[PDB]
Design a protein around this ligand. Sequence first.
Ligand code: A1IWZ
Ligand code: MG
Ligand code: MG
Ligand code: MG
Length: 308
Amino acid sequence: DYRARLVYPFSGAISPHADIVDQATLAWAAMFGLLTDSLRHKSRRLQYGLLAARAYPRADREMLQIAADWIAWLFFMDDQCDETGIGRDLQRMIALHERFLAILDGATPEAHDCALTYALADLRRRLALRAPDNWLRRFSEHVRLYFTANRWETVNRQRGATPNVATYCAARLFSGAVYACFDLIELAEQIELPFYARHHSIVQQLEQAANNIICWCNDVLSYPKEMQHGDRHNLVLVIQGEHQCSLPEAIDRALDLHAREVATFVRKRTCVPYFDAAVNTALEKYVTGLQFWICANRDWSLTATRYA
Ligand SMILES: CC1=C/CC[C@@H](C)CC[C@H](C(C)C)\C=C\1
Ligand SMILES: [Mg+2]
Ligand SMILES: [Mg+2]
Ligand SMILES: [Mg+2]
């Protein structure tokens, strides 16, 4: 059981609001028309709210609900990208992204805009009530880079071209939208980091390490369903192509890279410089937030129907 090798020298927590938030995320999905024909009794088992509850365990219920609805949005968008025709059609993906980008700039959806565009506009509206412009611009840019990454995946599928390890790992940091999920830690923890701390090389490196761990963990758990769809956006499949090795060996190599990235994250935690008492207090809440996300991703994914 190679899954038992997905271990961390720390553990997570879950918000006491978990089930309330999950029920509300389903009601939200139904309200905005995101639940497709194939899903009726499968809808109950999505449990997207129970991932959010683990990722932001200390958040107030209102802020947690924005995070849960956002996480659900990302799953709904992802299944369109990864399991339908739109992920093989760059021109259809560009037309959709043009609508999302107009909504991220604060435009109102038109009558004939799709459910995902309306739902994205709802999340932006609710975030604008809770966050300053500075934060909203950083979130929006992280979301734009997720769309760019999805268009990158679409070109790979159209060309039938598996990326090399260096290209894949560099792009995978954007294709999972993990940086946009990290932005929400600030709102969950109600912390205001000054510019020089927010963008410090050690903070960027801790964010990169946490993002890598989360994505490579997902890759080990999601290679089966991704292979079932003839997809190629997975460290296991990418390693297999580069090394011309067996699937068991590629899995072994992916888990080695995961273990190494956990150690890098633990090491770099002890390298955060002393700015001042108030800045380092806030900074340690953010970095603790990254740990909660690492654990949430693993803890939710091992039990989720999504990877069963
Ligand atoms: C692999 C991912 C890890 C981060 C988990 C979380 C952000 C889920 C939503 C988002 C889309 C792609 C589901 C992310 C993917
Ligand atoms: Mg995807
Ligand atoms: Mg996917
Ligand atoms: Mg995956």
